[PDB]
Amino acid sequence: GIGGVPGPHNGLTDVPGVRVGHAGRTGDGWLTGVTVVLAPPGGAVAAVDVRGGGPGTRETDALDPRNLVQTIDAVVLTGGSAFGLDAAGGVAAWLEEQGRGFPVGADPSQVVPVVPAAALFDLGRGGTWRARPDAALGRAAVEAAAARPEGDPVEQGGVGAGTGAVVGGLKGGIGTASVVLDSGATVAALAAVNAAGSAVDPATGVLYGARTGLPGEFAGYGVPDAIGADTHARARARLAEAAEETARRRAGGAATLNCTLAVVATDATLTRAQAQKLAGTAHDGLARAVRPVHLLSDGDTVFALSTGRRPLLPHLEAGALNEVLAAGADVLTRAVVHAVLAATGVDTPGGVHPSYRELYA
Amino acid sequence: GIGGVPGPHNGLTDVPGVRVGHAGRTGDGWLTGVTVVLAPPGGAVAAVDVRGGGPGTRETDALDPRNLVQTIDAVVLTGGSAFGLDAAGGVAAWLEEQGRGFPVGADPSQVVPVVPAAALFDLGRGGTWRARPDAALGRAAVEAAAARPEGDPVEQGGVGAGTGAVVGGLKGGIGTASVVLDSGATVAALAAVNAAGSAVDPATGVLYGARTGLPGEFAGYGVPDAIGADTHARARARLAEAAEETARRRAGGAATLNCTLAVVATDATLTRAQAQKLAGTAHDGLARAVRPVHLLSDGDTVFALSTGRRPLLPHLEAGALNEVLAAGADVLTRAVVHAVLAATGVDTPGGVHPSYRELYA
Ligand code: EMC
Ligand code: EMC
């Protein structure tokens, strides 16, 4: 069997034709950005599962299986909470210029791009409250995506929508992971991890998601299998210190708004309803990596994409879809772990957030 | 009984504290605009029922009854299809400046405005394809709303989001209607009518919604109870002529995207779930005014608001809510009829759309 191994770069672009672009702003009061997932020409079948709603979603109704539009070209993940939805307008503008969207005239230039977006809360984490992504930053992200070749490695860590992301007080960020199925199809995820809950078991210091990893995939990051009690005691103290200092700097504790945004993708052909099921099932992967999740205040959103390049079968259909559904959860769990490990700490007038590796590696 | 009569101006602002603002652009290639419904200080309980999705919705997930945010301050209705969602960013900016939104810091200036929006398709109807509402036009609409006193009459016709609206080939627009309940509560609707279907019975020329009118409310518009067969024959011919000319001018037939946007409001206190039921039930009012509705390509969206100023009871609760639910459908039916009657025809390089009264009055 050829399955159970990561794709070439262990990331979202291992789904052929998918491109990812980041644009960010750091320094001078800023710590935010935008990540765009760009489908190949012709678009991708897309669905969404939102748990905890807005503030900060756009065009989610368009992704209902009953609706007219059958594919989309781009999903926008952004900082800036509801304000950052402004980034999506810049992406829609770019798509129009490219002639990419729902056709609304005999002239191929006349199109309406359906651009779903979800935003995470990172306000003030650079120091300046009104420092949020705008249309220009959104445009920059999709232009960055378009400039990449197929199968290009995805940058992880404090980039794009992950720039200002924080998970349980630790620095969060962008992470990605993939897996090849025995059928040869690839399933992959990209996550911007900004959760209220913890990626770390408070009893041990072990990352919750680590036991879902594929053999050896995290070895390059350099964290021991066994974490010493003294190391974990020290890490907990440092995190508590950072949290108290952050609360002082923000003139108030920890954000009431938090979340994880994600895109799961595959080249296996899915109907919209099957993609909607995949988006829903991928939330399980988040639960296995972070605890607690899906709180009242947590705006967790997963988009699912199919490029429709491989038939599900190269109850047999159910079995094939179950493989994709199970992989969808696992790649999201793994992407969250990668985000946490890829992050480097920050220290700004808007927050002090050390990374996992700064505490445990 | 004091019920079964319209409120003071027969419109949405008969719900005390509600304000409505329009901003539009006409001429020089333009025929579009934005309508904002602004809740009183402290916000309103809000819900939504979307049928036919996007392209062109924003922050609808935030209105789910499970979610954190308990009230909102503004709903944005806009032209420009998905591009026009850009208008909502301007409204969010204004709300932030006013300190109005979900509180996210001990400082009252730190807020995240939840601004739901829905867009209708009017592209190119002024002549210029890229002539769509932007953030500035959205800001202008909410500023216009804020400048009005309570209980101010709502302008109808080709204004705000109704500027470029077309219903079954006839000029559409903004319409509004209200009714007082025996309890003393008011229920009202505002509609931007842009449907694929017809407001007019093709067999007779009679407006479908007219028989839902309250006694005498349409008398000021001057259309006979009995429409002559010859008048109706002439009207049908003129509409067909306008449709064929429009198709020539647009280098292609009639838009694939159409809809009706609406806001229903009441001062009776509703939970979010009760408001969601009201939004769903109000769609029935649309069905009674327009046929067909809710087609695959029709993006019909109804927002429902409660200002929470009157108790439902001043199974009794069910009976009181049923009165509100029934009124919600009726005021929407009536608002659609008002939109059709208030409209005046247009003739631009992007379309020829006569009004109902130009054909039948
Ligand atoms: C801040 C909820 Hg994605
Ligand atoms: C054009 C669908 Hg509100």
XYZ file of C-alpha atoms and ligand atoms in Angstrom:
728
model
C 0.000 0.000 0.000
C 1.160 3.526 -0.887
C -0.994 5.220 1.785
C -0.283 6.463 5.319
C 2.648 8.675 4.358
C 2.764 12.435 3.899
C 2.676 14.031 0.464
C 5.874 15.551 -0.974
C 6.035 18.618 1.326
C 3.556 17.483 4.001
C 1.123 20.308 3.332
C -1.923 21.663 1.570
C -0.219 22.159 -1.821
C 0.345 18.386 -1.987
C -3.223 18.465 -3.346
C -2.267 19.150 -6.981
C -3.270 22.598 -8.262
C -3.848 24.151 -4.836
C -1.836 27.279 -4.076
C -1.411 29.126 -0.781
C -0.371 32.751 -0.320
C 0.424 34.782 2.802
C 0.699 38.533 3.276
C 1.475 40.033 6.669
C 2.489 43.126 8.584
C 4.839 43.017 11.559
C 6.424 45.881 13.508
C 5.542 49.523 14.063
C 2.368 48.462 15.969
C 1.343 45.630 13.614
C 1.148 41.867 14.013
C -1.437 40.495 11.590
C -2.007 39.117 8.109
C -4.020 37.183 5.562
C -3.765 33.670 4.114
C -5.493 32.792 0.862
C -6.082 29.295 -0.441
C -6.381 29.495 -4.227
C -7.973 26.640 -6.183
C -6.688 25.748 -9.653
C -8.314 27.292 -12.730
C -11.929 26.097 -12.988
C -12.304 26.250 -9.204
C -12.960 23.591 -6.587
C -16.064 22.088 -5.014
C -16.309 23.754 -1.590
C -18.234 23.472 1.661
C -18.049 24.868 5.177
C -18.819 23.930 8.771
C -18.889 26.888 11.166
C -19.131 26.308 14.901
C -19.511 29.420 17.005
C -20.361 31.733 14.135
C -19.082 35.234 13.748
C -18.110 37.866 14.311
C -16.045 37.317 11.216
C -17.510 35.219 8.397
C -18.418 35.964 4.793
C -20.230 34.046 2.024
C -20.817 30.910 4.067
C -24.466 30.628 2.889
C -23.217 30.391 -0.708
C -21.567 27.075 0.187
C -24.836 25.312 1.074
C -25.312 22.192 -1.143
C -28.694 23.510 -2.387
C -27.310 26.676 -3.866
C -26.550 27.716 -7.457
C -22.772 28.225 -7.486
C -21.037 24.897 -8.006
C -17.392 25.816 -7.375
C -15.240 28.630 -5.948
C -11.690 29.841 -6.589
C -10.482 31.213 -3.237
C -10.964 30.991 0.534
C -9.681 33.869 2.670
C -8.383 33.433 6.240
C -7.617 36.709 7.983
C -6.719 38.483 11.175
C -8.477 41.648 12.312
C -11.685 39.964 13.471
C -14.781 41.334 11.680
C -12.782 44.330 10.383
C -10.409 41.980 8.561
C -13.247 40.709 6.371
C -12.326 43.834 4.379
C -9.414 41.747 2.999
C -11.861 39.565 1.053
C -12.947 42.522 -1.120
C -9.379 42.794 -2.389
C -9.378 39.113 -3.303
C -12.736 39.429 -5.108
C -11.306 42.368 -7.085
C -8.273 40.323 -8.152
C -10.444 37.366 -9.166
C -12.623 39.643 -11.314
C -9.490 40.934 -13.083
C -8.531 37.309 -13.772
C -11.996 36.507 -15.184
C -12.562 33.993 -12.386
C -16.002 33.630 -10.863
C -19.611 32.769 -11.507
C -20.428 33.775 -15.099
C -23.127 36.483 -15.326
C -22.867 37.559 -18.974
C -22.021 36.234 -22.437
C -18.816 38.263 -22.045
C -16.291 36.083 -20.118
C -15.090 39.207 -18.238
C -18.458 39.498 -16.461
C -18.137 37.350 -13.339
C -19.177 37.342 -9.678
C -16.460 35.785 -7.500
C -17.815 33.859 -4.494
C -15.105 34.435 -1.883
C -15.814 32.854 1.491
C -13.817 34.208 4.384
C -13.346 33.737 8.097
C -11.504 36.028 10.483
C -9.696 35.422 13.740
C -9.331 37.798 16.650
C -5.849 39.258 17.033
C -6.691 42.907 17.723
C -3.970 45.001 19.323
C -1.394 42.208 19.506
C 1.163 44.364 17.684
C 0.436 47.358 19.935
C -1.886 49.364 17.684
C -5.585 48.620 18.038
C -6.696 49.676 14.547
C -3.880 47.775 12.774
C -6.022 45.283 10.822
C -5.929 43.664 7.386
C -7.517 45.674 4.585
C -8.400 45.063 0.921
C -4.799 45.746 -0.164
C -3.382 43.103 2.182
C -5.960 40.577 0.945
C -5.008 41.326 -2.661
C -1.330 40.899 -1.775
C -2.048 37.441 -0.329
C -3.890 36.100 -3.383
C -1.267 37.617 -5.708
C 1.376 35.800 -3.640
C -0.577 32.553 -4.042
C -0.907 33.020 -7.799
C 2.857 33.547 -8.197
C 3.735 30.128 -6.743
C 4.165 26.983 -8.818
C 2.060 23.902 -8.118
C 3.321 21.705 -5.269
C 5.172 24.568 -3.599
C 6.043 24.137 0.099
C 3.733 26.132 2.402
C 5.406 28.543 4.848
C 4.315 27.854 8.427
C 4.490 29.756 11.703
C 3.887 33.462 12.226
C 2.856 34.256 8.679
C -0.323 35.345 6.946
C -3.402 34.872 9.117
C -1.138 33.148 11.663
C 1.015 36.254 12.247
C -0.903 37.391 15.340
C -2.347 34.022 16.352
C -2.210 32.764 19.952
C -3.262 29.329 21.262
C -3.876 28.930 25.014
C -1.475 31.843 25.617
C 1.353 30.259 23.588
C 2.217 31.640 20.182
C 0.055 29.972 17.532
C 0.308 30.365 13.778
C -0.066 28.589 10.451
C 0.425 24.836 10.245
C -0.166 22.289 7.531
C -0.082 18.524 6.995
C -0.998 15.929 4.361
C -1.474 12.200 3.860
C -1.681 9.947 0.811
C -4.471 7.376 0.747
C -4.094 3.795 -0.522
C -6.180 4.935 -3.519
C -3.444 7.484 -4.345
C -5.612 10.494 -3.458
C -4.155 13.104 -1.112
C -5.942 14.722 1.842
C -4.421 17.771 3.488
C -5.123 20.598 5.915
C -3.997 24.125 6.653
C -4.819 25.698 10.018
C -4.521 29.147 11.584
C -4.500 28.232 15.271
C -5.809 30.942 17.625
C -7.744 28.929 20.236
C -8.793 29.772 23.796
C -8.028 26.189 24.809
C -4.686 24.494 25.141
C -2.679 22.449 22.663
C -0.708 21.165 25.667
C -1.820 18.641 28.271
C -1.529 20.634 31.534
C -0.554 17.456 33.446
C 2.453 16.532 31.274
C 3.493 19.232 28.778
C 2.835 16.818 25.897
C 1.067 18.174 22.823
C -2.408 16.620 22.645
C -2.119 16.161 18.875
C 1.288 14.452 18.932
C -0.009 10.885 19.216
C -1.953 11.422 15.957
C 1.317 12.181 14.131
C 2.693 9.941 11.416
C 5.950 8.171 12.394
C 8.872 10.626 12.511
C 7.105 13.668 11.033
C 7.834 15.993 14.004
C 11.476 14.879 14.484
C 12.932 17.948 12.738
C 11.576 20.264 15.473
C 13.680 18.721 18.303
C 11.373 18.082 21.295
C 12.051 15.007 23.536
C 9.581 12.101 23.812
C 9.780 12.402 27.608
C 9.327 15.868 29.112
C 10.824 16.257 32.586
C 8.551 17.308 35.436
C 10.942 20.185 36.231
C 10.868 21.377 32.591
C 7.060 21.289 32.589
C 6.898 23.088 35.961
C 9.176 25.798 34.531
C 7.158 26.055 31.322
C 3.893 26.467 33.238
C 5.449 29.229 35.348
C 6.823 31.060 32.285
C 3.454 30.840 30.528
C 1.684 32.200 33.626
C 4.203 35.059 33.765
C 3.623 35.859 30.087
C -0.153 35.759 30.590
C -0.072 38.154 33.532
C 2.225 40.563 31.660
C 0.003 40.372 28.577
C -3.046 41.232 30.698
C -1.245 44.271 32.122
C -0.194 45.436 28.631
C -3.712 45.111 27.272
C -5.276 46.774 30.343
C -7.391 43.626 30.763
C -7.013 39.841 30.635
C -7.368 37.497 27.655
C -9.496 38.018 24.534
C -13.157 37.002 24.713
C -12.896 36.057 21.020
C -10.665 33.138 19.909
C -10.750 30.388 17.258
C -9.066 28.047 14.846
C -9.609 28.550 11.095
C -8.863 25.738 8.694
C -9.044 24.548 5.133
C -9.098 20.827 4.362
C -8.577 19.772 0.759
C -8.440 16.666 -1.376
C -8.110 15.677 -5.018
C -10.661 12.876 -4.537
C -13.901 13.894 -6.256
C -16.583 14.932 -3.754
C -20.072 16.298 -4.186
C -20.788 19.461 -2.225
C -22.700 17.439 0.402
C -19.740 15.066 0.778
C -17.425 18.071 1.151
C -19.802 19.486 3.801
C -19.535 16.194 5.669
C -15.728 16.384 5.390
C -15.727 19.920 6.799
C -17.869 18.759 9.749
C -15.842 15.656 10.399
C -12.520 17.609 10.255
C -13.602 19.526 13.396
C -12.934 16.238 15.240
C -9.279 16.724 14.388
C -9.324 20.070 16.099
C -10.820 18.440 19.227
C -8.005 15.883 19.312
C -5.359 18.640 19.162
C -6.848 21.319 21.475
C -8.858 21.149 24.731
C -11.331 22.610 25.294
C -12.649 23.608 21.843
C -15.935 24.955 20.438
C -16.694 27.115 23.459
C -19.485 29.694 23.243
C -16.908 32.370 22.390
C -14.811 30.204 19.980
C -15.467 30.874 16.280
C -14.015 27.678 14.809
C -14.514 27.391 11.030
C -13.449 24.660 8.618
C -13.696 24.966 4.831
C -13.418 21.806 2.725
C -12.300 21.721 -0.925
C -12.241 19.045 -3.621
C -10.318 19.621 -6.872
C -12.268 16.749 -8.438
C -9.291 15.201 -10.220
C -9.587 11.610 -8.964
C -12.628 9.382 -8.795
C -13.560 8.218 -5.296
C -13.404 4.605 -6.555
C -10.538 4.075 -9.040
C -20.819 -0.395 0.265
C -17.703 0.606 -1.661
C -18.350 4.329 -2.183
C -19.083 4.659 1.544
C -15.814 2.888 2.379
C -13.819 5.173 0.084
C -15.468 8.295 1.506
C -14.907 7.053 5.067
C -11.145 6.919 4.335
C -11.239 10.569 3.218
C -13.370 11.574 6.214
C -11.026 9.868 8.691
C -7.962 11.402 6.996
C -9.559 14.857 7.095
C -9.689 14.815 10.901
C -6.173 13.419 11.181
C -4.533 15.963 8.869
C -6.166 18.800 10.805
C -4.895 17.403 14.124
C -1.434 17.140 12.605
C -1.614 20.650 11.084
C -2.388 22.109 14.529
C 0.690 20.379 15.992
C 2.809 21.750 13.138
C 1.498 25.272 13.797
C 2.462 25.076 17.457
C 5.945 23.691 16.663
C 6.625 26.108 13.781
C 5.845 29.195 15.868
C 8.455 31.448 17.379
C 7.600 33.635 20.366
C 6.635 37.306 20.297
C 6.993 40.193 22.713
C 5.202 43.395 21.743
C 3.348 46.187 23.505
C 0.178 44.175 22.793
C 1.240 40.805 24.197
C 3.948 38.416 25.340
C 3.492 34.947 23.838
C 6.351 32.445 24.014
C 6.387 29.450 21.688
C 6.071 25.815 22.715
C 9.659 25.096 21.684
C 10.994 28.088 23.630
C 9.492 26.423 26.726
C 9.990 22.702 25.974
C 12.720 22.157 23.325
C -59.223 46.478 19.467
C -56.419 48.828 18.381
C -54.830 46.297 15.990
C -55.080 45.738 12.226
C -54.129 49.282 11.254
C -50.810 50.616 10.003
C -48.407 52.451 12.285
C -48.025 56.239 11.941
C -46.119 56.238 8.612
C -46.828 52.646 7.524
C -43.183 51.618 7.590
C -40.229 50.126 9.398
C -39.538 53.182 11.595
C -42.973 52.697 13.191
C -41.015 50.231 15.352
C -39.777 52.800 17.894
C -36.019 53.437 17.804
C -35.430 51.900 14.372
C -33.802 54.168 11.800
C -33.343 53.632 8.065
C -30.794 55.329 5.816
C -30.283 55.236 2.044
C -27.307 56.304 -0.049
C -27.323 55.932 -3.820
C -25.640 56.837 -7.077
C -27.579 57.554 -10.257
C -26.344 58.874 -13.611
C -23.001 58.881 -15.392
C -23.132 55.041 -15.652
C -24.458 54.387 -12.126
C -27.730 53.010 -10.799
C -27.125 51.446 -7.390
C -27.065 52.067 -3.655
C -27.149 50.892 -0.064
C -29.860 50.763 2.608
C -28.951 50.427 6.267
C -31.336 49.514 9.051
C -29.945 50.934 12.293
C -31.168 49.615 15.650
C -31.472 51.961 18.633
C -28.572 52.306 21.075
C -28.009 48.976 22.852
C -28.813 47.075 19.656
C -31.581 44.656 18.744
C -32.026 40.897 18.938
C -31.480 39.678 15.364
C -31.853 36.551 13.257
C -31.746 35.589 9.595
C -33.268 33.128 7.143
C -31.385 32.857 3.845
C -32.862 30.890 0.966
C -30.633 30.519 -2.058
C -27.457 31.655 -0.347
C -24.869 33.888 -1.885
C -23.176 35.208 -3.776
C -23.620 38.160 -1.487
C -23.996 37.528 2.248
C -21.933 38.497 5.277
C -22.022 37.595 8.993
C -25.065 35.350 8.757
C -23.435 32.636 10.941
C -23.124 35.187 13.761
C -26.929 35.308 13.939
C -27.330 31.630 14.879
C -29.174 31.310 18.252
C -26.261 29.295 19.729
C -23.691 31.993 19.239
C -22.077 34.472 21.648
C -23.216 37.877 20.363
C -26.658 38.674 21.733
C -27.579 41.794 19.746
C -26.473 43.810 16.696
C -26.736 47.473 15.701
C -27.031 47.455 11.894
C -28.110 45.363 8.900
C -26.789 46.346 5.468
C -28.740 45.813 2.223
C -26.746 46.629 -0.894
C -26.519 46.524 -4.647
C -23.387 45.397 -6.468
C -23.824 41.675 -5.811
C -20.828 40.157 -3.971
C -18.715 43.259 -4.721
C -21.207 45.433 -2.840
C -20.476 43.579 0.399
C -17.599 46.087 0.499
C -20.218 48.608 1.734
C -20.506 46.735 5.042
C -16.877 47.547 5.949
C -17.774 51.235 5.888
C -20.678 50.612 8.247
C -18.475 48.584 10.627
C -15.976 51.471 10.648
C -18.699 53.974 11.561
C -20.040 51.726 14.323
C -16.545 51.398 15.817
C -16.239 55.209 15.873
C -19.561 55.329 17.739
C -18.388 52.731 20.292
C -21.123 50.351 19.137
C -20.431 46.639 18.983
C -19.471 43.572 20.946
C -17.225 44.686 23.826
C -13.697 43.208 23.640
C -11.825 45.291 26.227
C -12.321 47.137 29.515
C -12.032 50.286 27.384
C -15.525 51.032 25.939
C -13.884 52.122 22.644
C -12.734 48.544 21.971
C -15.619 46.889 20.126
C -16.247 44.424 17.295
C -19.356 45.399 15.312
C -21.314 42.414 13.956
C -22.709 43.786 10.690
C -24.748 41.294 8.684
C -25.256 42.147 5.050
C -26.932 40.831 1.937
C -26.424 42.026 -1.619
C -28.645 42.018 -4.671
C -27.594 41.742 -8.286
C -27.910 44.976 -10.245
C -24.617 44.963 -12.155
C -24.419 47.196 -15.209
C -27.956 48.564 -14.913
C -26.647 52.139 -15.016
C -24.417 51.375 -18.016
C -21.066 50.895 -16.277
C -20.255 47.356 -15.192
C -17.872 48.187 -12.335
C -20.177 50.844 -10.817
C -20.859 49.150 -7.459
C -21.298 50.256 -3.850
C -18.093 50.644 -1.855
C -17.189 51.285 1.800
C -17.800 55.037 1.395
C -21.346 54.522 0.110
C -22.080 52.137 2.995
C -20.794 54.708 5.487
C -22.961 57.375 3.848
C -26.053 55.184 4.300
C -25.550 54.537 8.020
C -24.674 58.209 8.603
C -27.945 59.096 6.848
C -29.802 56.693 9.147
C -28.177 58.147 12.260
C -29.188 61.701 11.286
C -32.919 60.890 11.253
C -35.206 61.282 14.252
C -37.175 58.322 15.581
C -40.418 57.580 13.719
C -39.214 59.247 10.528
C -41.019 58.293 7.295
C -38.999 55.869 5.137
C -38.333 56.925 1.526
C -39.502 54.263 -0.928
C -38.885 53.535 -4.598
C -35.595 53.814 -6.460
C -33.453 54.666 -3.465
C -30.681 52.973 -1.530
C -30.424 49.263 -2.296
C -33.593 49.645 -4.391
C -31.993 52.104 -6.844
C -31.104 49.442 -9.425
C -33.688 46.838 -8.430
C -35.868 45.066 -11.013
C -38.762 42.651 -10.359
C -39.931 40.405 -13.223
C -38.606 43.017 -15.681
C -40.570 45.882 -14.082
C -38.761 48.466 -12.008
C -38.523 47.281 -8.400
C -37.206 49.216 -5.427
C -37.615 49.829 -1.710
C -40.991 49.305 -0.067
C -42.150 49.256 3.518
C -45.271 48.520 5.565
C -46.358 48.144 9.197
C -49.222 46.921 11.362
C -50.193 47.427 14.997
C -51.216 44.345 16.959
C -54.088 44.226 19.471
C -51.366 44.028 22.151
C -50.082 47.440 20.975
C -46.839 46.025 19.553
C -45.882 46.993 16.006
C -44.594 44.637 13.299
C -43.084 46.081 10.145
C -41.058 45.217 7.058
C -38.709 46.843 4.590
C -37.983 45.127 1.273
C -35.592 45.665 -1.632
C -37.455 43.851 -4.402
C -35.253 42.463 -7.200
C -36.927 39.124 -8.014
C -36.790 36.930 -11.120
C -40.488 36.165 -10.673
C -43.445 38.431 -11.197
C -45.331 40.655 -8.779
C -48.130 40.710 -11.370
C -50.588 37.941 -12.198
C -49.938 37.343 -15.929
C -53.634 36.486 -16.485
C -55.063 39.750 -15.100
C -52.455 42.459 -14.420
C -53.424 42.461 -10.729
C -50.627 42.631 -8.167
C -50.454 39.288 -6.345
C -49.881 41.026 -3.004
C -52.798 43.461 -3.305
C -55.405 41.240 -1.645
C -53.186 41.112 1.477
C -53.378 44.917 1.770
C -55.098 46.646 4.656
C -58.271 48.541 3.636
C -57.419 51.682 1.640
C -53.632 51.635 2.112
C -52.796 51.630 -1.637
C -55.422 54.251 -2.624
C -52.888 57.098 -2.865
C -51.116 55.398 -5.807
C -54.144 55.570 -8.176
C -54.590 52.128 -9.797
C -58.168 50.903 -10.595
C -59.712 47.857 -8.872
C -60.633 46.486 -12.309
C -57.896 46.408 -14.951
C -59.193 46.315 -18.523
C -58.157 43.428 -20.757
C -56.916 45.938 -23.361
C -54.807 47.763 -20.734
C -53.284 44.463 -19.595
C -52.642 43.375 -23.205
C -50.854 46.695 -23.800
C -48.859 46.405 -20.579
C -47.687 42.888 -21.454
C -46.573 44.085 -24.892
C -44.689 47.084 -23.452
C -42.957 44.878 -20.880
C -41.939 42.402 -23.604
C -40.576 45.299 -25.676
C -38.582 46.596 -22.701
C -37.228 43.104 -21.998
C -36.052 42.573 -25.567
C -34.402 46.017 -25.660
C -32.743 45.373 -22.297
C -31.336 42.078 -23.599
C -29.889 43.856 -26.641
C -28.319 46.577 -24.455
C -26.730 44.043 -22.136
C -25.530 41.840 -25.026
C -27.471 38.972 -23.426
C -30.850 38.308 -21.804
C -31.857 38.633 -18.145
C -29.613 38.283 -15.082
C -29.003 34.775 -13.742
C -28.858 36.322 -10.251
C -31.986 37.912 -8.694
C -33.550 38.216 -5.222
C -35.574 40.053 -2.640
C -33.830 41.331 0.513
C -35.869 42.226 3.557
C -35.788 43.268 7.168
C -38.744 42.526 9.439
C -38.829 44.226 12.824
C -40.943 44.402 15.944
C -40.880 45.973 19.390
C -42.359 42.800 20.915
C -39.626 41.029 22.887
C -38.330 37.937 21.075
C -35.566 35.496 21.868
C -33.110 34.913 19.040
C -34.806 31.584 18.211
C -38.199 33.315 18.050
C -36.693 35.977 15.774
C -35.243 33.186 13.585
C -38.728 31.707 13.320
C -40.082 35.155 12.377
C -37.447 35.527 9.656
C -38.398 32.100 8.247
C -42.107 32.709 8.433
C -41.780 36.169 6.760
C -40.583 34.421 3.563
C -44.226 33.298 3.199
C -45.095 36.943 2.665
C -42.691 37.094 -0.220
C -44.371 34.017 -1.768
C -47.777 35.697 -1.558
C -46.471 38.799 -3.376
C -44.209 37.265 -6.073
C -44.454 34.094 -8.208
C -42.321 32.128 -8.601
C -39.912 32.748 -5.693
C -36.968 30.894 -4.118
C -35.664 29.542 -7.410
C -32.211 27.945 -7.524
C -30.743 31.265 -8.685
C -32.791 33.505 -6.299
C -30.870 34.710 -3.229
C -33.805 35.708 -1.021
C -32.750 36.819 2.482
C -34.850 38.016 5.409
C -33.389 39.510 8.593
C -35.615 39.780 11.669
C -35.103 42.282 14.506
C -36.652 42.750 17.944
C -36.024 45.956 19.925
C -37.224 44.156 23.060
C -39.291 47.055 24.388
C -42.619 45.271 24.938
C -43.309 41.968 26.626
C -44.931 39.346 24.398
C -47.741 39.023 26.979
C -48.682 42.407 28.505
C -50.901 28.341 25.425
C -50.791 32.124 25.744
C -47.165 32.818 24.783
C -47.650 30.681 21.663
C -50.788 32.648 20.762
C -48.996 35.978 21.171
C -46.029 34.811 19.094
C -48.362 33.425 16.414
C -49.845 36.939 16.011
C -46.341 38.343 15.432
C -45.448 35.504 13.052
C -48.616 35.989 10.984
C -48.092 39.775 10.893
C -44.477 39.311 9.789
C -45.559 37.557 6.586
C -48.316 40.077 5.929
C -46.148 43.181 6.345
C -43.581 41.729 3.944
C -46.275 41.015 1.334
C -47.514 44.572 1.747
C -43.980 46.037 1.597
C -43.395 44.296 -1.754
C -46.598 45.841 -3.155
C -45.484 49.265 -1.911
C -42.093 48.826 -3.606
C -43.724 48.034 -6.933
C -46.148 50.989 -6.667
C -43.521 53.476 -5.431
C -41.140 52.762 -8.315
C -40.733 54.982 -11.329
C -39.356 53.570 -14.576
C -35.772 53.781 -15.810
C -34.136 53.850 -19.219
C -30.350 53.608 -19.243
C -27.678 52.028 -21.412
C -27.873 49.051 -19.025
C -31.624 48.433 -19.089
C -35.147 49.615 -19.827
C -37.506 48.910 -16.923
C -40.910 50.604 -16.827
C -42.830 50.804 -13.564
C -46.122 49.090 -12.794
C -47.949 52.421 -12.640
C -46.497 53.561 -15.974
C -48.193 50.483 -17.478
C -51.387 50.208 -15.383
C -52.236 53.541 -13.670
C -12.703 34.867 16.464
C -13.601 33.761 15.957
Hg -12.819 32.733 13.975
C -28.647 38.111 -5.896
C -29.075 37.251 -4.729
Hg -29.715 38.490 -2.818
